[PDB]
Amino acid sequence: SHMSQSNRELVVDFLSYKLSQKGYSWIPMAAVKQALREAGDEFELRYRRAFSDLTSQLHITPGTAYQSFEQVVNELFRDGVNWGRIVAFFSFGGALCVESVDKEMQVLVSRIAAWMATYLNDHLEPWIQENGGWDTFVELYG
């Protein structure tokens, strides 16, 4: 039970470490974590080239992320387990995660941008033009 919770600690730590590393800030365990982090870094440093976008290559549609994950991991351990494979396991998950957060960031930006830009045109562009446009805003500020 305790060992099962520590695994959760490892995964969360690896996924977090991978995310910030790619530019999204926000005996003992720490040895294991750093070791796992580094091993993952080496794995990615050696092999990342072969893959483009894992999501794209896997054809991940929303209702098939879990399946695709399980399918990949099951093939990865098809005929057994070694530490190399477990590293690739953590490494693979991290690439998925980073890839997902990236795509979703774009999605969220795309939406809110559309809400705001629609408002700007339907509600604010007339007033902007009545008052000298953006040039007069820039004069007022700076």
Binding site: Y47, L54, Q67, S68, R85
Partner: peptide
């Protein structure tokens, strides 16, 4: 078809190199 199998297989070969070197 079976992109997940294909890719998981690629990871497996890559994983096995890393393990051979430790």
């Amino acid at each position: 078809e079976q992109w997940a199998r294909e890719i998981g297989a690629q990871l497996r070969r890559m994983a096995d190199d890393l393990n051979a070197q430790y």
